Amino acid sequence: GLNTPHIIMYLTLQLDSETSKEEQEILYHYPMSEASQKLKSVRGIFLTLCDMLENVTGTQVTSSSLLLNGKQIHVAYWKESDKLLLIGLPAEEVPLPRLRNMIENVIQTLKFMYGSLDSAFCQIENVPRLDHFFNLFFQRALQPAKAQQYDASSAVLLDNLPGVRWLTLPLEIKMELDMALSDLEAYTILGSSLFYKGYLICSHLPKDDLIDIAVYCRHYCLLPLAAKQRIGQLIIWREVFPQHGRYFLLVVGLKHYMLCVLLEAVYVDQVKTTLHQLDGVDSRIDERLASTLFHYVALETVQGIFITPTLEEVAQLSGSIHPQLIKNFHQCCLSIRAVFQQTLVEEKKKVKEHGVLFECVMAYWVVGRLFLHPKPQELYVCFHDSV
């Protein structure tokens, strides 16, 4: 990752100043290192290509593929208003559909943070914050590291999905959680979403807002997984703009709970009291988490959640080549998502039972199924050829 080139850049499109210095063009540029000086120099072709293809083609540039020094580099564009935002990473680690999903998430998160991304980048005070966020994001994209690898192995697709890791809730615990959340609601609370061990254990938030908050947490290290060390006292109280006056994101992480609230224009004390009485629910959920479809990535896009076997399950399901089986699943799911993504573009403008088979000795037969007429959903399955 350190050696591979990677750039985030914010040149000013349609610049009309004869001072062609890099500062005049570039408004923000996080790396500013050896791995990015090349792209900083070659920004001219990016600008010229973007404007020319905007001219000839009714649509703007979404992706340019440059074979730089013998290695492939995908750069994703974004033209909004006299401004252009470019993200370039090597292909051999992040494929192009993953890069497009990643730029979509990045733009969404920036708009979430500082509203108009133009004001996000023009300001100088927030530059250290943007640099830290982009450092973490680039590290996530290029360095999967830093049972500890299953989450990293699957994050190729889990970050791609427009959903959130959801846990099959027992009904009694479900109503207990709903009662607790209602008590918490009883500024202005616009909903909430409680997570356990990184699993979305309850969600009263609207789907778009919940997705925005979850991806904001994912871009950081807030959301844990694999039952990490109990979150001590991390409380975040920030301003946000979830495409809807002044809005605040609150989030308290105590023990394994990762509770979040959205507020509209002292609440930490009441939410702490609310989660304090939730001292028995974790016990009731521990053994539930503990307790031939070898792997399913069943999704619910309308709800914004998806269900996959827990890490304890895959540890129980660990077999001869299962550690390789899961990663093979998760890299093929990217291609399945790519074709389904083309189909989704076709659907939102106004294919369905894709599958492959592997033998790198058991017939994995990973298959992606799409549902559109009912509540739209995706189902990625494994099964031996016998079944």
Binding site: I45, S65, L67, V351, H354, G355
Partner: protein
């Protein structure tokens, strides 16, 4: 479905031609082509290639060949893939080499004469751009048709080759080769696809003598190619480094088998071949033998348009080249309403990759077993 191809003088920075196939084969500002030339050159100086700059509606691919020629494509095709464009540029450069050669293409730059030499290439280029009936332009494999179980055809081809004193003699139909000399088979893959394609693209004449420069055989030695039209849509290719009568010496007693394989051009399958009723498309690929058997019409009931079936198979191949390169695939597609669409299957086994289009009612459970049975049936054929 609009494609705008461009060839440019790389070092000179002057347009060479702008063959386009927008809305079909019948079909640009100087400033815009200068702009793409400028961005390509800026990439070249900065030692960074420009493989693709795909937009939402279009997709482009540059190719700097021998640092002397520059190739651009503007493909607004729905579901266009990078591999299809890369193959198209590679093979169109192969065509340009065939029509002119290494010289006058690299090194020496003809400012205005090269226009005159390239004037002849336009027919082959726009045949390439249009939705032809062959796949050699995509799969890089020569399009073949199984002969009607006759070795006498190969024996007579060898006899004709001996009589004409040439090791490159091949009987080609509708652009698909049905018989060839061993030298023709061993001949390099880009020109192997090109030569039958050029013959098919050429208008039918009694006999044609044309100069060709083999991209791998002889880019500098101007080989001569003779097309002998025994009957329309079938030709004899005689490729040598001048007035043979041997066509009636050898092919006259071979008239009956030749008439038997005459309709096999579009058929690309032996008459009465046992195949599963669900099969609506065969695209057998033998990469070891560098051949492809492409049957598009085993049934004209569902998806009656053969053009639609060919486009579907080509898109499936462009999607499976990324996956494949025991392993199999299936990409059931179409409208979300049940009983519509198609089922596309892929199998790879011993360099014998095969694509199967199936009926919309074809069951999805036994798709792999169906593919294995089809591959076993077609194994002796190719």
């Amino acid at each position: 479905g609009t494609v705008h191809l461009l060839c440019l003088a790389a070092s000179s920075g002057v347009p060479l031609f702008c063959r386009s196939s927008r809305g079909g084969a019948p079909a640009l500002p100087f400033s815009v082509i200068g702009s793409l030339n400028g961005v390509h050159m800026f990439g070249q100086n900065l030692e960074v290639q420009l493989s693709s700059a795909r937009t939402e509606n279009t997709t482009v691919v540059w190719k700097s060949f021998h640092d002397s020629i520059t190739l651009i494509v503007l493909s607004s095709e729905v579901g266009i893939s990078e591999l299809r464009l890369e193959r198209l540029l590679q093979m169109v450069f192969g065509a340009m080499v065939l029509l002119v050669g290494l010289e006058e293409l690299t090194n020496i730059r003809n400012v205005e004469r090269l226009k005159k030499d390239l004037r002849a290439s336009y027919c082959l280029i726009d045949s390439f751009l249009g939705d032809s009936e062959l796949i050699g332009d995509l799969t890089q494999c020569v399009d073949c048709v199984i002969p009607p179980e006759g070795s006498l055809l190969q024996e007579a081809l060898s006899g004709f080759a001996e009589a004409a004193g040439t090791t490159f003699v091949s009987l080609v139909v509708s652009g698909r080769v049905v018989a060839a000399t061993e030298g023709w088979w061993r001949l390099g893959t880009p020109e192997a696809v090109l030569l039958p394609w050029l013959v098919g693209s050429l208008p039918p004449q009694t006999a044609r003598d044309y100069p060709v420069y083999l991209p791998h055989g002889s880019p500098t030695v101007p080989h001569r190619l003779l097309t002998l039209t025994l009957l329309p849509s079938l030709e004899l290719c005689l490729l040598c480094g001048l007035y043979p009568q041997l066509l009636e010496r050898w092919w006259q007693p071979l008239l009956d088998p030749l008439r038997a394989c005459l309709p096999l051009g579009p058929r690309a399958l032996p008459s009465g071949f046992p195949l599963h009723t669900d099969i609506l498309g065969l695209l057998l690929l033998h990469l070891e033998l560098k051949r492809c058997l492409f049957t598009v019409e085993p049934l004209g009931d569902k998806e009656p348009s053969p053009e639609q079936r060919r486009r579907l198979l080509r898109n499936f191949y462009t999607l499976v080249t990324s996956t494949h390169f025991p392993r199999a695939c299936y990409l059931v597609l179409g409208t979300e309403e049940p009983g519509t669409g198609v089922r596309l299957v892929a199998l790879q086994l011993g360099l014998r990759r095969l694509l199967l289009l199936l009926s919309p009612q074809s069951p999805t459970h036994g798709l792999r077993s169906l593919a294995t049975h089809t591959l076993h049936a077609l194994t002796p054929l190719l």
